[PDB]
Write a protein that binds this ligand. Structure first.
Ligand SMILES: CN1CCC[C@@H](NC(=O)Cn2nc(C(C)(C)O)n3c(cc4sc(Cl)cc43)c2=O)C1
Ligand SMILES: Nc1ncnc2c1ncn2[C@@H]1O[C@H](COP(=O)(O)OP(=O)(O)O)[C@@H](O)[C@H]1O
Length: 486
């Protein structure tokens, strides 16, 4: 009662803005059964009439899972959301939770609290008044399998981080406490098996009117905001891709540098690889290109998303270099840890590690592909996708001229043999799907490669769900023509 006041005051200041104001927050399109009012998420809006205790938010990389979870904490602490339903909302940031370290649910709850000695026994008195907000399930570093056990039913017993979170998700630990898990659809395969009567909600990103809203929030000058949005409107691809809020931020940040220069506002970008290479080349006034890539490849191959001072100092990134990338919105920072500005940037530098000119992790693309779609290595969706785009010889920049074209050709051969094995195999059943291979060929864009690869698919068997799916598939199909077509 009196401690809840202190906790809400703490939550109000800790979730004040996007990093570490919430005026740049633009509404997200949330749809259920995967017009959703957040207050009604836990209501039994069915004939069940028994409250919903598990709510799953499935959203792709950069769609706004963390931003929605942070807005949730702030709105709740401000008496605007669930004022009547929950006494405490605990924010569990999955990228900080060790899956090996032995900790109890009490120790985890106390981790979310401001003071060293919180009234843990008083908090746990009414478990139904607690909402556990697990943000980024897919960011749990290491393996997470449904065979772990025994399951824990004591909030005070210290268990392995995987047993602990597994017992909380399965609703064995505080059975009637509420849960809000945000995950990428890829990890929804691991998750589904633990879930107890969950309510599924899909984060779809920005509406065509919310992309315009974002651009106008980003640029204070209305003349700049309208010129930036008109560029997107002119470019079919950038308009389509700007449904992902992270794409809206990357695009806006890139046009700011171009605006400061005085160059006629233009962005020809046709792929995610083109956008990522455009944003990165705008930062360049690179010297630590080997260091940045090895850090990301090591962080993907050895499951490190947060890097302390020692992790950066061994990769050649001294005090000044870290402070330059933090200022250039390449790195992020009261945790004494540093990470990439996003997970998709760590995957861009991991893909780039395999193509760098020589002048610690394994650069064998064969072993990288062997771990594709595996939870342990983070699924490697964007590593492989960016790898397809960067290998395209009919594309260059000052950044790409620093990549070895000899190993880029060898890797181009192995990516064709990978498509050939995936497509000409009925027994696959898991990632990559046919649509996912279509996204890879879309990053390639080169017609000699795309046409050779599309001749491996016997029949087109895909499920379209977005206008991005239509664009990608449309491109691959129009480059799939039978040899004797006359
Ligand atoms: C696992 N597969 C199965 C087949 C269908 C796949 N659909 C997509 O990937 C659709 N899509 N498209 C992109 C683009 C094309 C911009 O790269 N992005 C998405 C999130 C982010 S964050 C970011 Cl940077 C780019 C990006 C997104 O969801 C998912
Ligand atoms: N609703 C939103 N309004 C404004 N910006 C947003 C919103 N959602 C996401 N973003 C932008 O996307 C970036 C990454 O989003 P985030 O939620 O961290 O991604 P993920 O879905 O991987 O958790 C943020 O830093 C921000 O710039």
């Amino acid at each position: 009662k009196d401690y809840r006041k202190k906790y809400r005051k703490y939550v109000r200041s800790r979730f004040q803005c996007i990093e570490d104001l919430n005026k740049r927050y633009t509404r997200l399109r949330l749809i259920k059964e995967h017009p959703i009012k957040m207050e009604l998420l836990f209501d039994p809006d069915d004939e069940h009439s028994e409250p919903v205790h598990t709510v799953v938010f499935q959203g792709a990389a950069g769609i706004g899972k963390t931003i929605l979870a942070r807005k949730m904490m702030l709105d709740w602490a401000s008496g605007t959301l669930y004022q009547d339903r929950f006494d405490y909302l605990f924010y569990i940031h999955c990228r900080e939770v060790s899956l090996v370290t032995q900790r109890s649910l009490g120790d985890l709850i106390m981790s979310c609290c401001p003071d060293p000695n919180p009234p843990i026994h008083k908090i746990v008195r009414k478990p139904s008044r607690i909402l556990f907000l697990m943000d980024g399930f897919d960011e749990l570093q290491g393996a997470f399998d449904e065979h772990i056990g025994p399951l824990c039913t004591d909030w005070q017993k210290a268990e392995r981080g995987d047993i602990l979170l597994s017992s909380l998700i399965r609703k064995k630990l505080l059975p009637e406490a509420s849960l809000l898990i945000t995950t990428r659809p890829v990890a929804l395969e691991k998750l589904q098996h633990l879930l107890d009567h969950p309510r599924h909600v899909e984060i779809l990103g920005f509406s065509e009117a919310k992309r315009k809203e974002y651009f106008f929030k980003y640029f204070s000058d209305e003349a700049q905001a309208r010129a930036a949005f008109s560029l997107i409107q002119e470019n079919e691809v950038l308009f389509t891709m700007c449904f992902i809020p992270l794409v809206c931020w990357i695009v806006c940040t890139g046009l700011k540098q171009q605006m400061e220069s005085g160059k006629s506002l233009a962005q020809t970008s046709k792929t995610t690889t083109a956008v990522y290479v455009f944003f990165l080349s705008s930062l360049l006034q690179c010297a630590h290109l080997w260091g940045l890539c090895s850090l990301a490849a090591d962080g993907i191959w050895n499951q490190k998303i947060l890097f302390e001072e020692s992790d950066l100092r061994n990769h050649g990134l001294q005090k000044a270099d870290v402070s330059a990338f933090l200022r250039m919105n390449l790195f992020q920072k009261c945790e004494k840890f540093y990470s990439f500005i996003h997970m998709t940037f760590q995957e861009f530098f991991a893909a780039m590690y395999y193509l760098l000119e020589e002048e610690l992790p394994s650069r064998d693309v064969t072993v990288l592909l062997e771990n594709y779609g595996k939870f342990e290595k983070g699924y490697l969706i964007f590593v492989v996708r960016f790898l397809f785009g960067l290998v395209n010889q009919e594309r260059t920049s000052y950044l790409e001229k620093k990549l070895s074209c000899k190993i880029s050709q060898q890797i181009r051969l192995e990516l064709l043999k990978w498509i050939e094995v995936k497509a000409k195999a009925k027994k696959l059943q898991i990632q990559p799907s046919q649509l996912e291979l279509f996204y890879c060929l879309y990053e390639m864009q080169e017609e000699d490669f795309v046409q050779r690869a599309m001749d491996y698919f016997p029949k087109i068997e895909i499920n379209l769900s977005t206008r991005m799916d239509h664009m990608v598939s449309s491109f691959c199909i129009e480059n799939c023509h039978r040899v004797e077509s006359l």
